[PDB]
């Protein structure tokens, strides 16, 4: 509906200003032929406020892409803050590195290349925890496992965020055989049953297709 | 669309459970003949999570109605925490006191009958500040006035939340001669220009009418 899309343009004119480093991140995608599957500016700004609400010095991010979301969330850090973002795709990492450097965030942001399910143990072992805020936005089937690792890297009051868990409302189809819809359905049922967190899911609308974000805080 | 309604039901099945005190507070609408406003269960849960992120011990709320939103947020507080809510209409404020007494929140929540524009000063004057989280959901024309007062009642890192700042998308009508629309537009431009906060507006869909919720952290 034009109304969701028009209202999103209205919100970002007032409160979703994109500076050059962010415009560059978006354009890096077409240049490197990467998929246009980043958060929107308004989601970007939302992630920034939540980070500020956790008084974030330490942020964990699964799924860098060109580092659009990374720039928004790293800008909530104070001078001596740290964001560690995980990326399977070395092309994606290398582009995210240029985009982070163009933003003057080289000293605050570290990109680890490799599978999330291999890097997460290495973050436990090397005691890089606890994180103030953790953004999960990678492949969907192992969402339930990424969250277990998330908890293992949390402190009481850590905000965990998991994006695209509604999937245009396809999670209503018990009979859907898409790995992503089945990953989200497992994750949503797991959240619902999890006693280590209090949580909800936000329904989001705008220029980006009908989206669902999970928010969970660690007790 | 029915997709939103169904997805809201999915989410509240999993994460939006309402106990006696919340369904009683809903019903107390019909039994005192007040309007079917109040947040959804899912907005209730979202507001509860925001209060815990803010580590809330003292919460301020404008517009009590039947205390539905009050009970949700109240339940984020320690035993040693307080919530003041301001209600224009004496009927509403008396009903609220029942539904809140029923929830066992009698000694954690103070209701105050009056126009918000008069009490908000009394609270500055009584030194009831600062508040961890302020929830604004009263008349829409005075929203920018309520916000200025909220800044007075704040500390750095305070979450201010202003609900219904989109009005089903009528804020896109600069020719609107509706006071609530022109009130919400003025508030939205004011957030747009305010250097004392970082803010966004979330577009919200589900069982309640399409609305928007402003989120501002005080720097
Ligand atoms: C949704 S995009 C991330 C976009 C980013 N959050 C933003 O808004 O700018 C998904 C990313 O996850 C990465 N990815 C997919 N599977 C992964 C895995 N198993 N481990 C780590 N990264 C993975 C993809 O390579 C891609 O870069
Ligand atoms: C949207 S309802 C609040 C419901 C609340 N969000 C909940 O879920 O329980 C609006 C309330 O604001 C009250 N109100 C209107 N103008 C007011 C004013 N000037 N000062 C205080 N309360 C006011 C109305 O009487 C009504 O109870």
UniProtKB/Swiss-Prot annotation, chains A, B:
One GO term under biological process is: methylation
- Please give the Gene Ontology molecular function terms for this protein: metal ion binding; O-methyltransferase activity; S-adenosylmethionine-dependent methyltransferase activity
Q: Which PROSITE patterns match?
A: SAM_OMT_I
**Domain of life, per the record?**
Bacteria
Binding-site residues for Mg(2+), renumbered to this chain = 137, 163-164
How the cofactor binds, per note? Exhibits highest activity with Mg(2+). Also shows good activity with Zn(2+) and Cu(2+), and lower activity with Co(2+) and Cd(2+).
Q: Which CDD domains does the UniProt record give?
A: AdoMet_MTases
Catalytic activities: a catechol + S-adenosyl-L-methionine = a guaiacol + S-adenosyl-L-homocysteine + H(+)
What is the recorded function of this protein according to its Swiss-Prot or TrEMBL entry? Catechol O-methyltransferase that can use various catechol-like compounds. Can produce vanillic acid (meta-form) and iso-vanillic acid (para-form) from protocatechuic acid (PCA). Does not have a regiospecificity, and produces the meta- and para-forms of the products in equal proportion.
Domain remark in the UniProt entry: Undergoes conformational changes upon the binding of S-adenosyl-L-methionine and the metal ion.
* Name assigned to this protein: Catechol O-methyltransferase
Q: Which organism is it from?
A: Niastella koreensis (strain DSM 17620 / KACC 11465 / NBRC 106392 / GR20-10)
